[model samples]
Target: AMSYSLYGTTLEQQYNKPLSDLLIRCINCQKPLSPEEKQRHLDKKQRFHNIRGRWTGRCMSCSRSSR
Candidate 1:
């Protein structure tokens, strides 16, 4: 079987249910992303982005890193 990069699991295994486009979320950034945006992120093989706004902690681009 082909090895999956993200989380060592295939997309089907990660999401065993019918995932709607509207329900997709960027766990790395912990925010909602457009379908194309999400696809772009996946295609770029990015683990996280500077697209945070709430500011709990951690954002390489935004001033939210509580470090």
Candidate 2:
């Protein structure tokens, strides 16, 4: 039998649903990133980049990966 791979937990969310790495960047001083800073960024990005749904054969970003 052939094998296939599944992504995420269910169908509503498939493909690379980017989970925030919790990487933080300073707004005031944009130089180096502290552990705290990185975490903050990652946290914020995660919140913002939350998954709305999951449908395959698409680019993941838009409803179409092929432009």
Candidate 3:
């Protein structure tokens, strides 16, 4: 099995159920997402982007350090 990332697990355990329920209750509505909900989605995207942009195979911070 593939390993699940920390952020994915976090949203599932913490945010998914509540957010899903909210969406389900709005199934018949055509209103825009609330300000708070929009902010949460943006924040999630930023976190994913930040992690992907970081050094993955090597530690840039330690590269400058003497062994």
Candidate 4:
């Protein structure tokens, strides 16, 4: 058995539900993200673009810390 962090546990629980029932809210910015928006945020190519500036729906504070 593999041990998971609290972050992993929360993500696992969230993804375990049906897609339609999933509500992806940013932990950093508290912004809502749709499935498509989540995909856009995961895209590395859009990393350079502004955070939450339309291209990527990621949390602005989170993106800054990541960069």
| TM-scores for every predicted model | 0.31, 0.21, 0.23, 0.32
| TM value for model 2 | 0.21
TM-score of 1: 0.31
Question: lDDT tens digits, residues 1-67, model 4?
Answer: 0122112333434444653454445545665666565544333223323223232224543665533
lDDT by candidate, in order shown: 0.36, 0.29, 0.31, 0.40
Q: Write the per-residue lDDT of candidate 3 for residues 1-67, one digit (tens) a residue.
A: 0122223334435435464443211112334445354344334522211132121111222245566
Off by over 4 Å in 4: 1-17, 41-57, 60-62
Residue by residue across 1-67, what tens digits does model 2's lDDT show?
0122222234213322542332223332433445453233333322222222321211232332455
Which lDDT tens digits does candidate 1 get at residues 19-45?
342244443476655545445433443
- What is the alpha-carbon lDDT of model 2 when measured against the actual structure? 0.29
Clashing pairs in 4: none
TM-score winner between 2 and 3, please give it.
3
Clashing pairs in 3: none
Error of 2 at 30 (Å): 5.9
By lDDT rank, best first, the candidates go: 4, 1, 3, 2
| lDDT assessment of candidate 4 | 0.40
Worst 10 residues of 3 by lDDT: 53-62
